[PDB]
Scaffold this motif. Structure first.
Motif, PDB file in Angstrom:
ATOM      1  N   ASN A   1      53.457  56.438  85.777  1.00  0.00           N
ATOM      2  CA  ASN A   1      54.905  56.226  85.654  1.00  0.00           C
ATOM      3  C   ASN A   1      55.266  55.409  84.398  1.00  0.00           C
ATOM      4  O   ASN A   1      56.189  54.590  84.407  1.00  0.00           O
ATOM      5  N   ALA A   2      54.495  55.583  83.320  1.00  0.00           N
ATOM      6  CA  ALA A   2      54.710  54.870  82.074  1.00  0.00           C
ATOM      7  C   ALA A   2      55.946  55.423  81.348  1.00  0.00           C
ATOM      8  O   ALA A   2      56.169  56.632  81.301  1.00  0.00           O
ATOM      9  N   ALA A   3      56.739  54.529  80.753  1.00  0.00           N
ATOM     10  CA  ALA A   3      57.775  54.941  79.821  1.00  0.00           C
ATOM     11  C   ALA A   3      57.129  55.496  78.537  1.00  0.00           C
ATOM     12  O   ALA A   3      56.133  54.922  78.080  1.00  0.00           O
TER      13      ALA A   3
ATOM     14  N   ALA B   1      35.232  28.582  72.313  1.00  0.00           N
ATOM     15  CA  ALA B   1      36.070  28.667  71.119  1.00  0.00           C
ATOM     16  C   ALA B   1      35.455  27.869  69.951  1.00  0.00           C
ATOM     17  O   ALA B   1      34.979  26.747  70.129  1.00  0.00           O
ATOM     18  N   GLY B   2      35.418  28.473  68.760  1.00  0.00           N
ATOM     19  CA  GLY B   2      34.784  27.895  67.569  1.00  0.00           C
ATOM     20  C   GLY B   2      33.249  27.942  67.545  1.00  0.00           C
ATOM     21  O   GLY B   2      32.656  27.534  66.550  1.00  0.00           O
ATOM     22  N   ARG B   3      32.597  28.445  68.601  1.00  0.00           N
ATOM     23  CA  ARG B   3      31.134  28.640  68.679  1.00  0.00           C
ATOM     24  C   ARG B   3      30.758  30.039  69.168  1.00  0.00           C
ATOM     25  O   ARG B   3      29.713  30.218  69.788  1.00  0.00           O
TER      26      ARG B   3
ATOM     27  N   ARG C   1      25.701  47.048  54.115  1.00  0.00           N
ATOM     28  CA  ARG C   1      25.261  47.466  52.766  1.00  0.00           C
ATOM     29  C   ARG C   1      24.074  46.668  52.224  1.00  0.00           C
ATOM     30  O   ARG C   1      23.477  47.072  51.227  1.00  0.00           O
TER      31      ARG C   1
ATOM     32  N   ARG D   1      35.031  40.119 102.305  1.00  0.00           N
ATOM     33  CA  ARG D   1      34.884  38.764 101.768  1.00  0.00           C
ATOM     34  C   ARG D   1      35.971  38.473 100.741  1.00  0.00           C
ATOM     35  O   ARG D   1      36.482  37.352 100.681  1.00  0.00           O
TER      36      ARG D   1
ATOM     37  N   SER E   1      34.495  29.296  80.612  1.00  0.00           N
ATOM     38  CA  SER E   1      34.942  28.678  79.359  1.00  0.00           C
ATOM     39  C   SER E   1      35.874  29.574  78.532  1.00  0.00           C
ATOM     40  O   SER E   1      36.561  29.085  77.629  1.00  0.00           O
ATOM     41  N   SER E   2      35.884  30.888  78.782  1.00  0.00           N
ATOM     42  CA  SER E   2      36.674  31.865  78.042  1.00  0.00           C
ATOM     43  C   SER E   2      37.096  33.051  78.909  1.00  0.00           C
ATOM     44  O   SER E   2      36.442  33.397  79.892  1.00  0.00           O
ATOM     45  N   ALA E   3      38.194  33.692  78.513  1.00  0.00           N
ATOM     46  CA  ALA E   3      38.609  34.975  79.070  1.00  0.00           C
ATOM     47  C   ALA E   3      38.038  36.115  78.210  1.00  0.00           C
ATOM     48  O   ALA E   3      38.119  36.044  76.979  1.00  0.00           O
TER      49      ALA E   3
END
Lengths: 482, 482, 482, 50, 45, 49, 50
Positions: free
Chosen positions: B143-145, B205-207, B228, B390, B409-411
């Motif tokens: 049902n996407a526009a 983040a940053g690592r 290359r 469960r 720690s991250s998504a």
């Protein structure tokens, strides 16, 4: 039945983990603390602040401890005018984009690989010949596959108008050196190059100093926008006492010593880049040529006020603080093989090193630690103690990415290399490893650099090596000393 | 008067927080530690390293503990030549962008929604008809526009020249499986797909491992540039002993067992993508067709050297370490409803799951866990223990984003789903919850996938389920065992 | 010889760090924990959920503790139709991009600086005159150097088709207010504006709520793409008990009190932006005008199941939890000088403040806290206790960037200002400083705003001030109370 | 150790410095003066001859 | 004899040691205390 | 950078430079720079960095 | 065991090495010298012929 059976399904192995459990997840416990308050106070320098000068401030005693410390810098907005339109055109020279010394230095290394009539060629033909010669140079030196010429022709869309801007990360660049002094003794010293390296490695995601130091991640159009108006920068000074509340500097315990910050300022000529060589740079509000007296700075200090009982206890027995001090080895580079003799002292936690091309420095790109054509300037490095390999030869990526991954909060976006003897060199209160350099007869960092590094137009490129070392600050009878 | 009054304004509630305070913010306390040193040592494989083969290394005993472990991989630079210009054109087949099997598979699902003379249409008209049929398909299924046709016509600006490149995150893809063995017993096993999922969820983040594993975040032009020239990758092997210094593997306590890393390598045909089907891929330096013997790898291990007293204490009583082991359920998918029977053992901390389309795998996009048209391949999932819910049916976003937000720690940037029984599954030393799967008769993960998932051109899509489980490694009399 | 000599090279200073070492890096120690399980359960509201209404849910007792809490929101996809083509064109008014009230308000401030015949000028000539007048205004007000007119003419490439979208961070905007109630007493209250400010300051890198709340970082094209289909949002409710496992709300200890979440929903007219004023906004699937009954929400709660022994212990003695409560001061702004009288109570940890222009609110840009022309709305602020400066006048950058750098996990991307009395205001279990506002006769936040802030078209701009304060929640005999 | 003046240094003005406490005794003291090089131009050729 | 490193760092004039002055010389001389001992008709450091 | 591997209690040190051209001209005690200028712009003394 | 000189090695200079104590006796001793390869160019073609 299943969830109760899981709680009953325990054996002799679970006893080591859960027998006599001293913690629960289902009840919060908290500790009570003593009463304290924080106050931020801005203080003027005791001497005049000017570009290229040294200035000092005696830190006021407005609380019981000193915690955070920020250098508050105010930079004027910049405007430009043609030298022909100016009643007094005589100003210091600034780096200019119509005279890109870094690009000219890069072209100089590929000149031997240009085939055909370069001198007589049209501008567009010269750009093609340089891009082809770059492929031939990189194939000969690095066995690189050729890039399509169109992919090497990156036009940075530079604006078709006149401008000047403060250099990238100007808040760090302004601080050539700062010294934290107590009772006339230097307790610690920090450098512009070290401040940048520390922010690259230890700068946490979402708390990078970008706006606070005038850093855009090399986006010239953002530096131009920022430089059209007055900028207020808050540069953190990462002294041992700013890293953890238990290390806050005990003002009450040091009552008979003056606490001073000394700052050596960058020269004005190094702080500004302009679109064209024939422009005069003006103070945007005052409409006068920019001069060394247009630098303004003050010190913002966070004081801690203690309850009388804790203040009296700290005055009677402040004891000793573990401190981290910084040491520097600065060397000129004129060859692809470089040995740095690291005459550092005390238990070293870690060291950082990086190179700066002369051409990048002369172009005003002070934190560009890249090699020729933006490549990694280090091929490999080795660390020797008393002529014995402590770390055998390793490639640049190991010193830059593997060491940062193991020991640091961030990986550097620039060619900064590190090595840690500590398991947690960012922990300010828990020693987690060191090497005592005061007990080594020789410490040598041997570097193999890229081809032609420190040759010709890059003669007197710079090697920076910074070390972090443990020492002890002692407080006794109202005095403080190492 | 106010700050002193605040310290006096205490009642019976403040007593629980501040009475008999055992900590102050105004004085640092530090703990002394034992003497130790860290040394990084690179070691060659005991067997030949080749694409599609299995290789092993016996880890040397160059210190008292083993801490970090990196697979150092060296990949040659790539060049391409037309098959017509090559004296020996016979090479393994590689995925090619002129034969985009993933785009062809996506088009196959919208063919029933193409209105008009598709077969006879001009190329530009076929692209329009496909974009309109995508709107009709998405309206009918979701049902996407409708999106404007111009917004669906994303030209990836592909370069107008010939190239080949190593696939995205090649450092992980090369490691189809690695086994950590002690005394001939497998202590733990890791997979390419698990390494990627672990970096997505636990990568700070940053690592992020980007450069260290050859990951560009799906920017083909950066993979081309990197490919290359010679690439040196440092792939971290996330064994239990690499997670915390107190879990470092006690070499001295395991003196009578050989420690081995076994690595099953990816096939060369899966590692490379080329611009066109008729190109031969060459080693850039050697100018020969790329072959299975061009893979080079070594093991970089960080050893810990202990003071004699700590070494002797550890040799006398290394005791037991809590370890995390990995388990895998790998299944083919040929229907939109999938039930995975998770025959995992021990106290499971958490599990990860994700799907790979056959078309994404065949296109060489090995870490593309997206569905048809880049959509989420999971609509919903349910977790059953002994046929009892469960976790009742939850939408994909709950398993992907809510579980990652709560426990990681991250998504993940890709369609990786997780579920934790532990409050802190990333803490390697503190157990914080588990479900004992060795006490469950059935564990079922029921999935409802997107429409037409595993149909037609995606027949034999892959479901990956990985679990992390607690076990105990015991050290006794110079031997180590589970 | 060197590494053994380092272990022997100890003096009286090393004794304070390493004598009687209670920790080793070479052996892991772990603690055993009690048995527990986590279950996520979705629950419908007890009352109807609708835009602009208030709804409540009584939280079920499906475990022993309550941990995480998410508002699961389902928003329909949007489509648009011309009002002339619609059988029932009568709908609530929505903000529209053809009537940009924020841009019109910005133009109104520069009208006095337009030189020449503005009223009769062509559209392209009006845009030039406005950009020149912006330079003259900024030179007169801020001594700003003029920007090139071409650099001010940023065309946002808006698509040449009709659309409507849900406003930026719609998941927060929908929650005008939420109240956590126990036994009919309000324990805590959160606001849309506070939720956004908390995510800006405390939102960790790689765990930002972007997708979970419908936030694109002000990329209108991504909001449009997302708004074409049904959206499922998982908005975290940051109550004290969601911050740490030891603060989980003890359901078993509060057996005789109903636990309720009350939510005041945003009005539908404020939630949607459209390309043009003459469009009707439709539900994409149902093909009917969007109405207040199209909002769907449910509550997703994570329950903790305890072992019987821990459950019984918690029921017998849950004791007291340290809690953080939120307080709000909301004020209209009609002048560049604003004094906010902060009538907050209890030990305040920290406060946040920010301003919203009326024009930004009316444009539907609810989290745009910028001033006129996107500038910083605050020039300076001062904090007074009993008419004495607790923090003397400081520039906006100090309150925004320095306070965030010192005390927060992130620096805000918007003009959010903070001030902490706590050394670690994000630690939910360890008090680290506060100011007791229930013992201060006056707390005043004095603001100097940008020129013309709250004048003319921005009359009734909003000042938000939120404070975080400590209180104690007590559990006794199956009852819970502050 | 070289130390800057606490006030601005200018011709015809008075300037002061507070001497730092960087050791236990103070021995030698030198005023380090830096004077620019001089050039001359005819007053007729100068845009500001005053 | 108790310092691990003693370094004299020099910045020289421009083009010092370049071209026709390649292999210019730096001299550093130090004066140090020692003790000469005389015993039983012998002398030694 | 000169690494001064001297021993014992040092009272003082002297340093100076000689151009190759001055030596080759037989002017052995001419420690001047180019055009008779001072060959040193600045110097720093470091102990253990 | 190969050991570097304690001072810089240069033509026409004096250099010294302090011999390490890596065993109980010292037997053979060799000076390991590394000389670069030589090439020639006409003085007229050289940017610095001196």
């Amino acid at each position: 039945a299943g969830s109760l059976t899981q709680l009953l399904a325990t054996g002799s192995m679970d006893a080591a983990l859960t027998q006599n459990a001293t913690r629960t997840f289902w009840k919060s416990s908290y500790q009570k603390h003593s009463l304290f308050a924080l106050e931020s106070i801005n203080q003027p320098f005791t001497t005049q602040v000017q570009f290229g000068a040294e200035s000092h401030i005696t830190v006021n005693r407005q609380g019981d401890l000193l915690s955070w410390m920020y250098l508050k810098i105010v930079l004027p907005g910049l405007k430009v005018q043609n030298q022909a339109d100016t009643v007094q055109p005589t100003q210091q020279s600034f780096a200019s984009l119509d005279n890109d010394v870094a690009a000219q230095a890069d072209v100089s290394h590929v000149l031997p690989y240009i085939e055909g009539a370069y001198t007589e060629a049209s501008l567009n033909t010269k750009e093609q010949l340089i891009a082809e010669a770059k492929n031939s140079y990189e194939a000969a030196k690095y066995n690189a596959a050729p890039l399509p010429v169109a992919a090497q022709m990156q036009s940075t869309e530079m604006p078709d108008f006149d401008y000047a801007y403060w250099t990238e990360a100007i808040g760090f660049h302004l601080i050539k050196r700062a010294e934290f002094k107590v009772g006339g003794a230097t307790i610690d010293t920090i450098w512009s190059e070290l401040l940048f390296a520390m922010e690259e490695l230890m700068g946490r995601a979402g708390r990078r100093l970008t706006e606070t130091i005038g850093r855009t991640l090399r986006r010239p159009t953002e530096l131009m926008k920022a430089s059209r108006q007055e900028q207020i920068l808050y540069v953190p000074l990462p002294w041992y006492f700013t890293k953890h509340p238990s290390l806050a500097f005990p003002l009450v315990a040091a009552t008979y010593h003056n606490i001073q910050l000394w700052v050596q300022w960058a020269q004005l000529n190094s702080c500004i880049i302009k679109s064209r060589s024939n422009l005069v740079v003006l103070h945007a509000e005052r409409n006068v040529p920019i001069s060394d007296d247009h630098l303004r700075a003050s010190l913002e200090c966070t004081y801690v006020h203690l309850e009388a009982a804790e203040r009296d206890a700290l005055t009677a027995n402040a004891g000793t603080q573990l401190i981290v001090q910084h040491q520097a080895h600065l060397q000129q580079v004129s060859s692809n093989n470089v040995t740095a003799r690291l005459n550092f002292n005390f238990p070293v936690l870690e060291f950082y090193y990086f190179l700066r091309r002369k051409a990048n420095k002369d172009a005003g790109d002070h934190f560009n630690f890249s090699g020729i054509g933006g490549r990694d300037p280090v091929v490999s490095a080795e660390l020797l103690f008393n002529n014995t390999a402590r770390v055998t030869q390793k490639p640049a990526v190991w010193w830059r990415a593997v060491q940062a991954l193991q020991f640091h909060s961030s990986a550097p976006l620039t060619n900064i290399y590190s090595y840690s003897f500590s398991l947690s060199p960012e922990d300010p209160i828990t020693p987690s490893g060191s090497a005592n350099f005061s007990r080594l007869d020789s410490v040598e960092l041997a570097l193999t650099l890229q081809d032609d590094f420190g040759a010709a137009h890059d003669a007197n490129s710079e090697l920076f090596v910074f070390a972090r070392s443990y020492n002890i600050l002692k407080f006794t009878n109202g005095l403080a000393g190492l």
